[PDB]
Write a protein that binds this ligand. Structure first.
Ligand code: HEM
Ligand code: HEM
Lengths: 146, 141, 141, 146
């Protein structure tokens, strides 16, 4: 993805302040609460019947950490998202059977979580840069689908 | 909102379909799988090879459900109740996928109804599929 | 369908927006133009720079409409009938854009309500915005 | 886009059978009838009150021939769609103010027209090849939006 120096700067600056563990768990949790159909991939995670159950589920927080961690690594290769996520793309298609539409929903929830967490610091321009980034990541993860 | 005229159009086109509802239903799925491969993520357990009994059988279930909807065009929520539950709580198919199958059913009808697929009918059928899609995704959350 | 809990959630959250409704509507528009540049194609007659009084004025109108929607949560189609007519027949904004504005409204709300923007409340507002989008696109065809 | 040689030939073979002016008028008319909001750019075209009015309108036909002629010429540069449509991309954004969603709607209507026109010859595989082409053209026309 092509980001202007300004968009790149914005992205990196904010990311330095993110507690990947915490933010990862919140983002995955909100995905499961706001778009309940996404729970279809987590049957073995236990109790997901209520918002409090989802948010406080250790398997959810654990997975969230994992996902945002991989996401994190992607920020370091904004110039080559496809090549960076090719292996995971294939895994998600071939082994996990995940509809890439889910990457898009996660992207939007992440933006909501960033806004919630950072408040006024998540300005319109910053949002716009993250929107390009989450779009990019989603595309990269869907690239090896067949 | 399906106008009176829409309903008339849909009933006329579907009648035409008649006995091929099953065959048409299989072809629409096959067109989906090929055109939009991400939809295959919902059928990992299926034999998706051209002309598989699985696809033929499923195409017939899909066609029957649509016939039911035309029959009960005025009471769709009621008519498709069990199916919306299935899709929403059991299958949990992302709603975006409904547009893809709808487009594929529209292409299948166009390919098979040369006399009937006029611009007016095409509009009514598109609205009908959107309406069915709306019902099927209304209990998701 | 908005549950009794969803209605309660939406009234609490909108209640807290209070007098800031208009500023938030402006911010949401600005977030939309920046993040989804294609939405600018509907406002070629507007000065879209940051701080634009036109954007602010328009944001206040949008916010006021949402206020009216919350006040009439069980009678939305009637309360928003003129707006549905307007968007459907005069403005003719492609339906796809409604999800974009909804998202930017969610983002704005999250940035302003640290306390109230709970997972539960987030789901209720998402549902509420989809319900409003539904009403506004109901007369398109 | 990237089409396999088999797909490129499938697209090419069928296109040689298309009356570009006829299909053009038909695709544009059908766009205006099935998604009436698309009529917003053609208020100067005259009577668009009913489906018959739309389909028989000489300006709709004229415009349809224009759009599909461009599309047609485009099929000779499948290897370079972005480059082929860059200037047109810019025009549609800067001067015409056309939501790129319209390109996607037209692409789908074109696919329905081809199916209606060709019946059984428009097989699933051929459809898939056209789908990649219409998504390619729509992407190319949207590329320069800002
Ligand atoms: C026009 C919209 C649709 C209609 C009318 C429809 C209809 C049906 C019917 C009648 C069944 C069989 C239920 C039974 O056996 O009791 C079914 C099952 C199913 N549908 Fe749909 N469906 C639609 C959209 C979708 C979409 C868009 C997808 C995914 C892309 C999907 C995926 C499935 C799956 C995975 C099953 C279960 C198949 C199995 O395991 O046998 N459906 N649907
Ligand atoms: C939550 C959904 C929406 C709400 C509540 C809403 C509300 C409104 C209101 C209250 C007005 C002013 C009506 C008047 O002049 O009496 C308006 C006008 C307008 N809306 Fe929306 N709208 C929504 C979605 C959209 C979207 C998604 C777009 C395009 C991306 C859009 C584009 C416009 C335009 C272009 C105007 C006319 C502005 C002018 O030139 O004065 N609306 N809308």
């Amino acid at each position: 993805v092509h980001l202007t120096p300004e968009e790149k700067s914005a992205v990196t600056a904010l990311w330095g302040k993110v507690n990947v563990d915490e933010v990862g768990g919140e983002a995955l949790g909100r995905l499961l609460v706001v778009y309940p159909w996404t729970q279809r991939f987590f049957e073995s995670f236990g109790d997901l019947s209520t918002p409090d159950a989802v948010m406080g589920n250790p398997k959810v927080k654990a997975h969230g950490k994992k996902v945002l961690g991989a996401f994190s690594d992607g920020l370091a290769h904004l110039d080559n998202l496809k090549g960076t996520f090719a292996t995971l793309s294939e895994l998600h298609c071939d082994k996990l059977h995940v509809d890439p539409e889910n990457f898009r929903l996660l992207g939007n929830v992440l933006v909501c979580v960033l806004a919630h967490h950072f408040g006024k610091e998540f300005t319109p321009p910053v949002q716009a840069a993250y929107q390009k980034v989450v779009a990019g990541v989603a595309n990269a993860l869907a690239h090896k689908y067949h | 909102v399906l106008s009176p005229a829409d309903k008339t159009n849909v009933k006329a086109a579907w009648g035409k379909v008649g006995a091929h509802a099953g065959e048409y239903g299989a072809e629409a799925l096959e067109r989906m799988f090929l055109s939009f491969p991400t939809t295959k993520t919902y059928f990992p357990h299926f034999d998706l090879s051209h002309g598989s009994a699985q696809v033929k059988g499923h195409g017939k279930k899909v066609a029957d459900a649509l016939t039911n909807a035309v029959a009960h065009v005025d009471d769709m929520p009621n008519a498709l109740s069990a199916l919306s539950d299935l899709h929403a709580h059991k299958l949990r198919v992302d709603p975006v996928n409904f547009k893809l199958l709808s487009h594929c059913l529209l292409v299948t009808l166009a390919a098979h109804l040369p006399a009937e697929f006029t611009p007016a009918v095409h509009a009514s059928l598109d609205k009908f599929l959107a309406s069915v899609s709306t019902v099927l995704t209304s209990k998701y959350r």
